[PDB]
């Protein structure tokens, strides 16, 4: 509650309205895996569509609460057809992006003063605070579009390359094969699976999106970016690894790596290396460049 | 300076069980108990001063309610930043998958 | 132990200076060099302080707070024997100064340099050609005082000469003529003029104190901002309330992101240098005064 | 004894003491009557215990340089005095044989005092009973001492149900589960 | 003691341990407590009651 | 101030003085029951209600005025599974359930002497049979493991003495890795081990030692020896009655009779088992 | 083995100040305005108490009626309004001689060296203050922190609700962080201050003032004595080895 | 009267850390405790400064404070042997260190940790398991000058947390990074992370901000407001013909002799103590010095 | 330790055994009839020691 005065008095002093949010920690399973860190460093930020773009970034400080007299309130505290982000950090390797939407907040706002209301993007009930003081289906969708887009040229990149090379194959990293099976030149059934996972995988947080944005020319130049994602969807992706390989050794790994000058490498279970071209638009280095940076 | 002082360590258990088949050596004692069903659930110790002593369950709680027993996360943490853990193939329950 | 030295004058002394030297035996000098015995020109301030240029405060601050201290004990025709002051050791004081400032018992003593006019601070060597330059001594809320008025002085005749409508120079007079310390009243006659040129005293520590005094709260609104955590002061969130709300309404991203670390690197330094000087630089005290004898016992 | 002592005194050095204070009241008092029991330890045990009481009493006065009394046979001094009866005195005298000069010099105004010595461990300590001239004047023996010490004893205590014995041979017939005691015994002076 | 550790398959990364609690006395393994431990802490729990 | 130097060598190669323990004059810490309470060892965590904790802080958790049988022993307690054996009790072992000797092991290998004391493919030096018997003390990341290593805790506070510390510590089992003689000379050279205080009520960890007299071989061959242990009253009075033909192990209940270097003399009423 | 101390001589009347006072306790003294070689008007800390309003029952068990003292201070009301109070206290240093006079009294105290009185070849002396009204700022906030050679004596006054009360206390880390723990200390005494803040203005927010009274022997620690007057049973704390050297009042907040 | 401490060694060093010891002689380092006979590792600075941990320099300051300083004055085999610092007595002391700064007569030193570089003031001893860490002692200006960097960036790494790289570029590495001086440029050591004890220290500096900006006078700001336009100075050339609209909006009310001479006495009160939050080391006062020798007589 | 006291009765403040023989009581009898339990329950002489 001490927040909601200290922003008032610092930055409610630079920013004009504020609307006061309480998170359920069962809203916070979505984001974090196995993990219940404090939410200090959380950034809130909004974004608004079909009109025009722009994030405000913000930390509301957040801290588990005893204070609700009601039961069900224990837990942490922190044109309306549009987004607010909070992006959560800590010391470790753990980052998440929550979204927020109004027409909870606004309805919810009605009347410890409390009203619980639910999310659309991850649904669940969220619990909204009232101090004494105080076109629907494009709007969700763009995020989506944009980035499977993206996925779509780099996929039809990868096709352009293979057609350079008469349709095979090359191997540009050091891995022995498994076994010299005679059941395994049907590798069709991997390649394809790529085309399955790649074009059914977008979040806002991939490898290329990082790659995008560089610090440095010569620092980018030196690094690369990599993600794998497991085949045919037995468990949870792991996106935006650095590499200051071993995973084309092991199997159930379709690497992905990407330079900051936008090359990519598909690389298949055997060491099997694809190379890849990106195209990104200065409307696509706009958005990444306002949301990522 | 010769008068030294030597330090030792002892240890004793309490609340053990015996197997099935149950055996007395000696022939004095006839307890009323039925010998399959009995248990031991406290110890005696003889003090310095030849005084008897229990050491009971309840005595025992003064570590016995205490967080460090409880929390895992030390133990997980200890377990996995090993290099090698065990062979990973361990597949079935693990999480409920809804209809 | 033994610490009295003596300087030998180049030119015998005519009788008036004699006689103005016997008026002012028990009062302290600047003493260039830790060794006494050398030329005349290292026990006068006059090379820091002179009828010539113009002197700037900080310089004659800068330069009291290195060079020793020293007490006359005996002037003779071709001689000046000094006492050199060391912590730990018991002196004598009588206050010949020519401005009268009641000295009281278990009271602290102050050395800083003087705002007066120079025919009252020091005596002219004809004999030798040389000037002779006496640091004043004073209480310490009474000098504390002293330089809050000369410095609202310097700022209000600063501003009548920028503009002269807003600021009326008989309220100036009225306030800042009279000290009152313990019932004792002394009338202290301020700098006489500012003028275009750069001013006598002053106008050094006031351009120091003014870009301070700007440069505070755009600071202080960017330091209380980056500061919030959990592991903070309590208090701090207390005192959150207490700054005035257009203070509290500055945005950051005005002032350019590297200028922020320049006003606040220049805005510290200024701090620091201008802390230690309101301590009011050397610093003694007395432990019983004599008002009909004249005579402090002070260490 | 300076080994216990040696840290100063605290609560567990205090406590100890106490501890041992118990174990010697317990277990070396009336040990002349205890000497019957041994039977072939008759003079190494008493002559144990009297070195171990000449030990205890500190041999350093602040005077430094004390003149001393001397046996009749000369040279080496006296160094304590027995106080006993006469009973105690004959007893002693049987156990410990090998009777010295009597007649000690030491004392002037030379004079054959008559202290009965025995020689204990390095030094020469003399034996004397006072009894007669006691008797003489019909007045108690003060050395004839009479200790209280206090007895307690439980009765009608119950015994819990997990009963459990160690004798084979009685067999009481009360049916064990259900009896309790309602009365204690006491074995007499006589 | 408490608890059950177990190693879930590695995806991308490799898998941390996880641990679930037992909850109950009797879902200790029957190595460290067996049957007859089981059933005599009955009859202790049943004369206790 | 009057300052006087001295200088010693040692003229012979081999060792030409031994000491030697020769008669027991006092045991100033009692062999009682006092468990060491972790409220005072960790203050600083908690569980999650504020009235759970207060509770199970009030009924279990809770200087001394007076004290009659000396300095009072703090006691530490390793859960064990119940199918544990009653003979690895009976004879000297170390609490962990596999043996601690690293001075069999060669020298200077931290990975060959690790592997005797934490892998568990390979049974115990002890016996070959079992790999140990309580595993939730020996393996690494178990129960004991958090319980009594020193400087995984961390949250520790420092001034309160820790037995199994002696046991459980890397550290101080790694050190033992050398060559003997070089245990030899450092046992007696120097202090260490982190041992107890003397003569205080609650048994610190000692600093100063100023003239304070240590002399620990159970660090050294790293096990403790079993005390009397009777499971209930009938056991205890039949081993007071008979020595020699009594039951170490009955139906159901168990006796351990005392394997200690120091004989004590044990007396209940008029009799006595020494 | 020092250089002597330099003494100091006080003419007081002897009205307000009691002879029963014991030999070692630190006093401080009074400005007046127009005469101030007649009376010096020194205070000792249980007549500062009774300045300010089982300490109170000798406070008033020792000095009866106060208006005397209300004389001597006549602008106490007006001073706690300004914060001027602080600006006229000065330390002097603990007591040594008191020689009796009906109307007049001499105190001879300590303003700066080891403390000592001057008779015989120079025996040695203890200040004394009550361990109420004393705060242990060591015992308060408590690897291991290391083993000063000397510890300071500070002293604070401090306007409470409840008007001003000083405290001394008794630490040996440092000047330049004992300033901030006691801010660290005097947190929620200023928690209950700012009730009524915001119609006074601007001279009012100081909340006290802090010197440095001098170094006493570490690595030692105190005693627990007491008061021998008819009724008192009143412990007092006592130290050895003492070297005065008062400093200047530096604003706490 | 008698300051000597020998420190025992348990076990021998070797010649390759005896002959640099040796090197090492006359220098600064700090003790734990006042006794003749002295653990190694309470003589090590390398306790509050472990390897492993992050680097926290201002605890260390809090440390050095604490702890005892000495002077080396013999490495024997076994042997440590220092005097110590009475505070009233004279003593000669040596400089002979790897950030190299060349000292001034009558010019006050200051001890430091050692922020510059790790190897470079310290020695290990790989014989004994420790490492010997010698403090940093500078003189006083450049010292408040690294001091204010330390503070400036303990701030200016919580303020940059991610967003514009274009305060990362400049504002982490360029005023907090570097340390200049005559013909001279050295490095600081940077923590990667912004760790305790120092965020303490910015809560006492914005309580005495707060109370600060409560009191503060208007005419010093009509003083720089009318000279950064009508006039130009090189005290003024951080401000060009644009002010900080701040100042035009505290800049509407009047002057008046009453008030900003009760705002002054209270800027006056608080200015006092901020001597001690900022001098946090202890003071030598250089009374010769030797160039030829690298050996002054501190005081 | 575990236990507090044997017989509470006996032990504490103003418990039975304590009015049996504290020094508290002054009606009873002369002197005369000497207590052995007097020697275990007065206040004075036991804090003699």
């Excluded at chain 1, 930020?45 to 509301?60: A, E, H, K, M, Y």
């Excluded at chain 3, 590297?258 to 802390?275: E, F, G």
């Excluded at chain 6, 599974?81 to 690293?102: E, H, I, L, M, W």
């Excluded at chain 6, 129960?143 to 199994?164: E, K």
């Amino acid at each position: 509650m001490d927040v909601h005065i200290d922003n008032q008095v610092l930055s409610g002093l630079g920013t004009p309205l504020l609307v006061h949010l309480f998170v359920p920690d069962t809203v916070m399973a979505e984001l974090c895996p196995n993990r219940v860190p404090n939410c200090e460093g959380a950034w809130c930020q909004t974004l608004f569509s079909d009109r025009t773009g722009l994030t405000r970034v913000c930390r509301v400080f957040a801290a588990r609460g005893m204070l609700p007299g009601r039961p069900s309130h224990r837990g942490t505290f922190t044109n309306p057809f549009h987004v607010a982000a909070l992006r959560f950090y800590d010391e470790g390797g753990l980052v998440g992006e929550l979204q927020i939407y109004y027409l909870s907040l606004f309805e919810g706002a009605k009347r410890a003063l409390v009203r619980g209301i639910a999310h659309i993007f991850s649904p669940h009930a969220l619990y909204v605070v009232t101090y004494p003081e105080l076109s629907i289906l494009g709007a969700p969708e763009r995020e989506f579009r944009f980035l499977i887009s993206v996925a779509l040229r780099i996929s039809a990149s990868f096709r352009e390359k293979l057609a350079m090379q008469a349709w095979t194959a090359q191997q540009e990293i050091p891995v022995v094969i498994p076994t010299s099976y005679s059941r395994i030149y049907k590798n069709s059934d991997l390649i394809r699976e790529a085309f399955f996972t790649v074009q059914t995988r977008v979040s806002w947080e991939s490898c290329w999106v990082k790659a995008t944005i560089s610090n440095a020319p010569k620092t980018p130049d030196a690094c690369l970016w990599i993600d794998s994602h497991p085949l045919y969807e037995e468990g949870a992706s792991a996106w935006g690894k650095v590499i200051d390989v071993a995973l084309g050794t092991d199997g159930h790994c379709v690497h992905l790596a990407t330079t900051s000058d936008g090359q990519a490498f598909l690389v298949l279970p055997g060491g099997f290396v694809i190379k890849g071209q990106l195209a990104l638009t200065p409307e696509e280095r706009g958005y990444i460049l306002a949301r990522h940076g | 300076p010769l008068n030294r002082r030597m330090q030792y360590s002892y240890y004793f258990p309490v609340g053990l069980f015996m197997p099935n088949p149950k055996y007395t050596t000696s022939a004095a004692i006839k307890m009323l108990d039925n010998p399959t069903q009995q248990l031991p659930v406290e110890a005696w110790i003889v003090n310095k001063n030849n005084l008897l002593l229990a050491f009971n369950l309840q005595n025992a709680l003064k570590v016995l309610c205490h967080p460090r027993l409880h929390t895992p996360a030390h133990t997980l943490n200890s377990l996995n930043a090993a290099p090698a853990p065990r062979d990973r193939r361990e597949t079935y329950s693990l999480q409920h998958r809804r209809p | 132990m033994d610490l009295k030295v003596v300087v030998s004058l180049s030119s015998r002394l005519y009788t008036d200076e004699i006689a103005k030297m016997q008026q002012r035996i028990g009062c302290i000098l600047p003493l260039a060099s830790t060794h006494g015995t050398q030329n005349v020109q290292g026990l006068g301030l006059g090379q820091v302080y002179s009828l010539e240029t113009v002197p700037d405060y900080v310089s004659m601050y800068n330069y009291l707070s290195d060079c020793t201290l020293a007490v006359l004990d005996e002037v003779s025709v071709d001689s000046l024997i000094l006492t050199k002051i060391v912590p730990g050791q018991t002196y004598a004081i009588k206050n010949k100064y020519q401005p009268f400032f009641q000295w009281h018992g278990t009271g602290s003593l102050s050395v800083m340099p003087p705002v007066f006019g120079r025919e009252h601070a020091t005596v002219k060597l004809e004999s030798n050609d040389v000037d002779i330059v006496f640091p004043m001594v004073l209480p310490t809320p009474i000098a504390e005082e002293v330089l809050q008025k000369i410095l609202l002085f310097n700022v209000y005749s600063r501003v009548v000469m920028q503009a002269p409508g807003n600021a009326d120079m008989l309220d100036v007079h009225m306030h800042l003529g009279s000290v009152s310390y313990l019932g004792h009243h002394y009338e202290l006659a301020l700098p006489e003029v500012p003028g275009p040129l750069g001013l006598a005293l002053l106008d050094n520590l006031s351009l120091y104190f003014c870009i301070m005094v700007t440069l505070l709260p755009r600071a202080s609104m960017r330091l209380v901002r980056g500061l919030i955590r959990h592991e903070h002061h309590d208090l701090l969130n207390l005192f959150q309330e207490m700054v005035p709300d257009e203070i509290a309404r500055i945005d950051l991203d005005d002032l350019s992101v590297a200028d922020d670390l320049s006003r606040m690197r220049v805005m510290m330094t200024y701090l620091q240098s201008l802390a230690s000087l309101f301590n009011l630089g050397p610093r003694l005290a007395t432990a019983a005064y004599s008002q009909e004898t004249l005579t402090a016992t002070c260490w | 004894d300076p080994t216990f002592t040696e840290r100063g005194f605290s609560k567990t050095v205090k406590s100890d003491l106490i501890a041992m204070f118990k174990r010697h009241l317990l277990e070396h008092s009336f040990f002349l009557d205890r000497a019957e029991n041994m039977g072939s330890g008759f003079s190494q045990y008493v002559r144990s215990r009297l070195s171990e009481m000449v030990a205890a009493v500190s041999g350093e006065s602040v005077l430094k340089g004390v003149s001393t009394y001397t046996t009749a046979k000369g040279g080496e001094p006296v160094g304590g005095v027995f106080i006993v009866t006469d009973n105690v005195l004959r007893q002693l005298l049987t156990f410990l044989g090998e009777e010295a000069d009597n007649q000690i010099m030491g004392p002037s105004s030379r004079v054959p005092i008559s202290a009965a010595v025995i020689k204990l461990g390095n030094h020469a300590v003399a034996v004397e009973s006072l009894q007669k001239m006691y008797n003489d004047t019909q007045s108690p023996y003060p050395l004839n001492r009479r200790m209280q010490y206090s007895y307690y004893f439980p009765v009608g205590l119950f015994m819990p149900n997990p009963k459990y014995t160690t004798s084979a041979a009685i067999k009481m017939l009360d049916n064990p589960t259900q009896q309790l005691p309602v009365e204690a015994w006491i074995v007499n002076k006589n | 003691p408490l608890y059950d550790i177990y190693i879930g398959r590695d995806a991308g990364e490799r898998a941390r341990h996880r641990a679930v609690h037992r909850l109950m006395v009797g879902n200790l393994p029957t190595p460290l407590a067996p049957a007859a431990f089981q059933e005599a802490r009955g009859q202790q729990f049943e004369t206790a009651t | 101030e009057v300052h006087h130097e001295m200088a010693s060598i040692d003229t012979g190669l081999s060792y030409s003085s031994t000491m030697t323990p020769a008669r027991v004059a006092a045991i100033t810490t009692d062999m009682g029951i006092h468990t060491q309470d972790f409220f005072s060892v960790f203050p600083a965590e908690a569980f999650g209600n504020q009235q759970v904790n207060d509770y199970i802080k009030a009924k279990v958790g809770a200087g001394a005025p007076g004290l009659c049988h000396g300095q009072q022993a703090t006691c530490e307690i390793i859960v064990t599974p119940v199918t544990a054996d009653v003979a690895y009790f009976q004879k000297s072992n170390s609490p962990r359930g596999r043996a601690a000797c690293v001075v069999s092991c060669e020298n200077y290998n931290q990975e060959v002497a690790e592997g005797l004391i934490y892998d568990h493919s390979r049974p115990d030096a002890a016996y070959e049979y079992r790999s140990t018997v309580n595993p939730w003390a020996s393996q690494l990341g178990s129960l004991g493991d958090i319980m009594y290593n020193s400087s995984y805790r961390q949250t520790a506070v420092p001034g309160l003495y820790s037995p199994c510390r002696a046991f459980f510590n890397k550290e101080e089992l790694l050190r033992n890795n050398r060559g003997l003689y070089n245990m030899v000379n450092e046992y007696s050279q120097r202090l260490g081990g982190h041992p107890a205080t003397s003569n205080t009520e609650v048994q610190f960890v000692v600093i100063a030692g100023t003239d304070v007299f240590l002399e620990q071989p159970c660090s050294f061959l790293q096990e403790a020896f079993p005390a009397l242990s009777a499971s209930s009253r009938a056991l205890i009075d039949e081993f007071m009655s008979v020595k020699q033909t009594h039951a170490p192990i009955h139906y159901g209940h168990y006796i351990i009779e005392e394997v200690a270097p120091v004989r004590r003399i044990l007396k209940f009423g008029n009799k006595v088992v020494f | 083995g020092w250089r002597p101390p330099v003494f100091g001589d006080f003419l007081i009347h002897a009205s307000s100040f009691n002879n029963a006072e014991a030999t070692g306790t630190p006093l401080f003294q009074f400005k007046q305005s127009d005469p101030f070689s007649g009376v010096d008007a020194v205070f000792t800390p249980l007549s500062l108490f009774i300045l300010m309003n089982g300490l109170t029952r000798m406070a008033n068990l020792l000095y009866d009626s106060p208006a005397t003292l209300a004389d001597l201070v006549p602008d106490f009301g007006r001073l706690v309004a300004d914060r001027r109070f602080h600006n006229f206290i000065t330390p002097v240093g603990p007591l040594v001689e008191n020689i009796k006079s009906t109307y007049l009294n001499k105190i001879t105290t300590v303003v700066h060296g080891p403390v000592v009185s001057k008779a015989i070849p120079r025996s040695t002396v203890k200040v004394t203050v009550p361990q109420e009204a004393f705060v242990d700022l060591d015992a308060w906030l408590s690897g291991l922190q290391p083993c000063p050679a000397d510890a300071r004596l500070y002293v604070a006054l401090t306007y409470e609700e409840a008007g001003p009360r000083f405290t001394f206390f008794q630490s040996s880390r440092g000047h330049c962080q004992i300033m901030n723990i006691l801010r660290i200390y005097y947190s929620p005494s200023i928690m209950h201050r700012y009730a009524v803040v915001q119609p006074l203005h601007i001279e009012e927010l100081t909340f006290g003032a802090v010197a440095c009274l001098g170094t006493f022997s570490a690595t030692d620690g105190w005693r627990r004595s007491a008061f021998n007057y008819r009724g008192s049973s009143l412990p007092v704390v006592e130290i050895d080895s003492f070297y005065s050297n008062v400093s200047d009042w530096e604003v706490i907040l």
